[PDB]
Amino acid sequence: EFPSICERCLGDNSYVRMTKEPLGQECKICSKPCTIFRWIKERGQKPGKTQICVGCARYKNCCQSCMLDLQFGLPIALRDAALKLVESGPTNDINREFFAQNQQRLLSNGETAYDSQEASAAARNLVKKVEKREXXXXXXXXXXXXXXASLNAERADYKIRKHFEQYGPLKSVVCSHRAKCAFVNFKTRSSAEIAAAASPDGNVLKVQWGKXXXXXXXXXXXXXXXXXXXXXXXXXXXXXXXXXXXXXXXXXXXX
Amino acid sequence: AVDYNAIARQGHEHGELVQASFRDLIPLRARLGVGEISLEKPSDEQKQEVANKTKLALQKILSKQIAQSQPKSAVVQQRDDPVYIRYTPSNQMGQALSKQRIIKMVTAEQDPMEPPKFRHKKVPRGPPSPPPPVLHSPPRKVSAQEQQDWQIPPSISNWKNPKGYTIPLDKR
Amino acid sequence: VQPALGPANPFVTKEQDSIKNSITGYAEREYVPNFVFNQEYYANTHAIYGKRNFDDNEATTS
């Protein structure tokens, strides 16, 4: 009557000494008395311990320590969100006691197994589901501000970090999705000057030199930059957005 | 009715004696498809099988009741045979398959003192085993005079008439 | 022996095929004298350390 326990934790050795203790911790999920099973994995490793009761790790199907699902190797939360196989959902203090007791009530009476064919069919389906989803006037006005180390990246964060870090020593990087912009600040100006000319008109961009109510104003600026990008590719809201676009530049210049 | 009587049986974990058809209300003298009616009271060699089955079963329960009832102060027993085992793993993620791995179980021997390790959580009991067919005799005719003859006049007190509910003095 | 006979279910993934007493793998009782198990266990560990050590450390001798 040894425990669930995956192959992954038992470890490198074939022979394994381990101790039961018939009534240690009540299970985390189940919240009822169970048996603790302790063992060592490696030479000077701190020893393992089963965290769940078997009644649960039947239902949930995982290494009574590792909790990585037996079939795949991904976490149990990660699994239930993506694959959505058994579709469990208590996630409470008290409801999760009964719900998880109710599944132990279900499986014990009628042995409803964890079917692995239909499980694997969910994965290969999810894999295919991922693939289907998937300038002169500037530099002059820019040089006028340069004479009188930050680049405004107009028109995701990791790629903004990747493409700019490879062109010099970075001070810091920003982004706002609603803003739809990112201020890349360099340690030196020699890098920021070089990165401006390199990343001008590039995919992953307008690379210039940088300079309740806040939510509605920024969400208004999102609809303004969306129609601004749509028009250049190709009426009252477009004119009203132009009036708002002119009003912001007047406040920026005056201040 | 061939594939439907497996609606009343569902669940139960023990439902082969459950009734289903009208046949079940039919006396054993008329079932039609019955060889012989046995009224005798089985045997002695079953009597002594059963009595053994029951008595062994109760004893395993009574023993375990006595175990929980008394905590057995200082009475600490060492099931001190290292139980050895072999564990054949079932291609879990993939990769290495078998080997067989000999586990060696041992019982860590509980400190005499430490008091109980968990509280008594009280949770509402689960729902019962779904019910069976009712199979009553056919409902008798009632009539409107009969249902009037069981008319029950609401009684009213001389003393205990709480709340309000005023009642005229010609109804007393 | 008496084999099963039939066409064999074709779908059968890796996870179903093994006979498992307790989810991960079949588990059964053993009766090995402990001295053999303790003796066996140490030799296995040295090999594991040796790979991590990367040193064979020669053979055991008199």
Binding site: - | - | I19, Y26, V36
Partner: peptide, 20 residues
């Protein structure tokens, strides 16, 4: 000493007692 009836369980594994 006490006697009992039959049974003769089959082991899934082969090979000796200590190895695995």
């Amino acid at each position: 000493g006490v006697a009992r009836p039959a049974g003769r369980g089959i082991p899934l594994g082969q090979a000796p007692v200590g190895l695995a």
